[PDB]
Amino acid sequence: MENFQKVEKIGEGTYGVVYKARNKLTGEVVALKKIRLDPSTAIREISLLKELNHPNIVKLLDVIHTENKLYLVFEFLHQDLKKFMDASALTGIPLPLIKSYLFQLLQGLAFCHSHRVLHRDLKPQNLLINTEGAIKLADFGLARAFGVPVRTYTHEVVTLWYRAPEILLGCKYYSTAVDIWSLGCIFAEMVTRRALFPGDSEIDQLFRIFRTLGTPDEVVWPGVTSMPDYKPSFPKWARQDFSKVVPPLDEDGRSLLSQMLHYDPNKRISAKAALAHPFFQDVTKPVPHLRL
Structure with missing residues (x-):
């Protein structure tokens, strides 16, 4: 979290922990999903979804692949x-x-x-x-x-x-x-x-x-x-x-x-x-x- 501030752990998701967090640069509140590893092909596939934008699709703000970890950043809903x-x-x-x-x-x-x-x-x-x-x-x-x-x-x-x-x-x-x-x-x-x-x-x-x-x-x-x-x-x-x-x-x-x-x-x-x-x-x- 050199880029965010965990507001809280929200939830234990299908694939990994879900956080409420604040983007440090923008101040926006977002849902951060950590994807747990037990893969280069997953990265390209998931990245394409950043273009699949519609008012009834939760917006995928970023796919952050750093320190050999995968985080998905989504638009936060209450x-x-x-x-x-x-x-x-x-x-x-x-x-x-x-x-x-x-x-x-x-x-x-x-x-x-x-x-x-x-x-x-x-x-x-x-x-x-x-x-x-x-x-x-x-x-x-x-x-x-x-x-x-x-x-x-x-x-x-x-x-x-x-x-x-x-x-x-x-x-x-x-x-x-x-x-x-x-x-x-x-x-x-x-x-x-x-x-x-x-x-x-x-x-x-x-x-x-x-x-x-x-x-x-x-x-x-x-x-x-x-x-x-x-x-x-x-x-x-x-x-x-x-x-x-x-x-x-x-x-x-x-x-x-x-x-x-x-x-x-x-x-x-x-x-x-x-x-x-x-x-x-x-x-x-x-x-x-x-x-x-």
Whole structure:
């Protein structure tokens, strides 16, 4: 920190400690992420992300590779959606605000996907909110750089709750569709105030999906039975109506959610097409109640 002043340790992140800090030259308050090493290719990849700028993407201010350490410097936001939902539990987040947040998140996805950048590990903790009604995606493009570990550097199990079924079934080829799946899971959790698929192992995650959406088959997902971790012995569950899964979401929202949670990644709606869905015909940008 020949260039910053640690305000505090904030948090123990996926990849290393996160600090609130102050840039010595500019006086700006930033999030500093240390990336723990247990790689020249990661550096070039991560550096390109300094150009991937959008109002709904947390700004990557610098990639500092000095003293054989890697620090990522981000624009600082005061709250994340995991804390906001926890704090909103008694009441729920109001539907206009859910709608605004989903709309903004799809804008961010659409931007990144247009530039052929995926997230691959979306979750409420990496969706950051401000006092102005904005929401932004944190940590985009990182996974194609460091992977997604089973455990953090402090042994915090990395959540499986938002992971797409093709990843659980052992598919190595990611597509943009993995991010639409995770955002649909998040959209259902905002509405019902409960995680959709809170698995605690790969098979629990996969079977929670199957009990709600039905066990996938070659009719709904051509190719599924040839995926690496598919087993013909998987129990055969029937598919639940979305009316039972996410009440009191309206028919437009239920239709859009169903499109975001299609099994076949090639059937799943794109972010660009989701922005044109009738669920957004009355979208607005409310001011949230944030206590900081």
